[PDB]
Design a protein around this ligand. Sequence first.
Ligand SMILES: *[B@@]1([O])O[C][C]([C][O])O1
Length: 261
Amino acid sequence: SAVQQKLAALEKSSGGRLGVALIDTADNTQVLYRGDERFPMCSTSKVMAAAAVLKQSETQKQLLNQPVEIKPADLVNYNPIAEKHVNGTMTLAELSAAALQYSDNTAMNKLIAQLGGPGGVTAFARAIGDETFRLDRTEPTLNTAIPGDPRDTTTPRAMAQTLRQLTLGHALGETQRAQLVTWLKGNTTGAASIRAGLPTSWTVGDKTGSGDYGTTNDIAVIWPQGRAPLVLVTYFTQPQQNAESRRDVLASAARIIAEGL
Ligand SMILES: *[B@@]1([O])O[C][C]([C][O])O1
């Protein structure tokens, strides 16, 4: 189709490898570009960890208010929010928000610990029907994004389906889903990524990711004003380990998708 030709051209112009999946919930139609190839998730994995904790809170009703101590040894490479609470506590809700809205890596590691390790996050994916997602490592090493390495990867198609289920479907309880949506809509790191390729009037909730090999990712739910929502996953990675981030590619891919509607 037109859109796949334009995405391929965008990819060729970028020098990297682009993966896109769009679900239009109006007719449950799908647009895929490298939709079944694996890509390093980097911080887009934080959505799954937060959702797993939300799922736990359906039974442990007070779980999100549980305080978790932030110690100096907990700090890793990128901890904008946790740093503000060293030698103090954050609740699991605050950690989930920090992981999602600021991409805080310490917060992510606390979420992983709450779930019993990366295998606990992966287990949640399996439990909601995602056979593709795999989380193998903690922060920061899950961002190594080595070409061909299956660790800490998913495919665009899988992640789009899973994001749809978590935010628009009923993989989570009603209060939990609403909370996740609220968190994603309040993301602070996304302005140059999918959001930048979309009409300013559309509401977006997204989670970015970035890693080595110039890996530049964003996953979003999109509420166009007067129109069924869309789920859009854009993954991008490059052949050079030290490549620079290319958020513009994700913006351009979103723009191309939006044109075709
Ligand atoms: B994710 O990908 O978003 C930022 C942090 C940097 O390590 O991880």
